[PDB]
Amino acid sequence: PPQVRPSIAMDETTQGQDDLTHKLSDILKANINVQKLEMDGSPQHIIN
Amino acid sequence: MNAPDRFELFILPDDVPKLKITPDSRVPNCIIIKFEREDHTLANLLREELALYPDVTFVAYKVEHPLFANFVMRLQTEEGTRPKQALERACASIINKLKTLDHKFNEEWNIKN
């Protein structure tokens, strides 16, 4: 939940996500990129 | 921010008496006096005046804390005498001594002119 990775406020209008949130976003991007290889051309040096 | 006022040393509040007398029951004919808003100036004067009376058997004072402007005085007297009466007697005697001292100082100062 967001409690484990809360955001914060820089100057009254700004927020950066916690490290875990950006890490989870990167994991999601990696997952979707994986689901973009077994659906089309993939010369075995991109799947790995 | 925690400093008390410099006039609470001498200015008596309205809820604080100047003088408060309680008896010491352990020994006969003894009383404990707390003087508020006073210091060593009155205490030592009174103590050394009272210590020289024949009928005063015990007299002492202390200032329990320097940050609080009061002192407490223990005074005992013999059977006939009351410590209170000895206290007025000492006050009157010191008043007379200061009056004589003032008269002689003024005369001396005039002669020096």
Partner: protein, 51 residues
């Protein structure tokens, strides 16, 4: 000073150069009953200036 009586011992007395250091008690005294907490842990924040 209280009695005007002489002190039985004599006192080493004279001028000495002293310094006023930057550490004053009024810059250090801090108390907290309840106040702001941290976002993540919900525990009291760190700092005299932050309460």
């Amino acid at each position: 000073g209280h009695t005007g009586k002489k002190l039985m011992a004599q006192v080493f007395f004279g001028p000495t150069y002293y310094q006023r250091l930057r550490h004053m008690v009024d810059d250090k005294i801090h108390a907290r009953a309840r106040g702001p907490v941290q976002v993540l842990t919900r525990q009291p924040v760190e700092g005299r200036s932050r309460d």
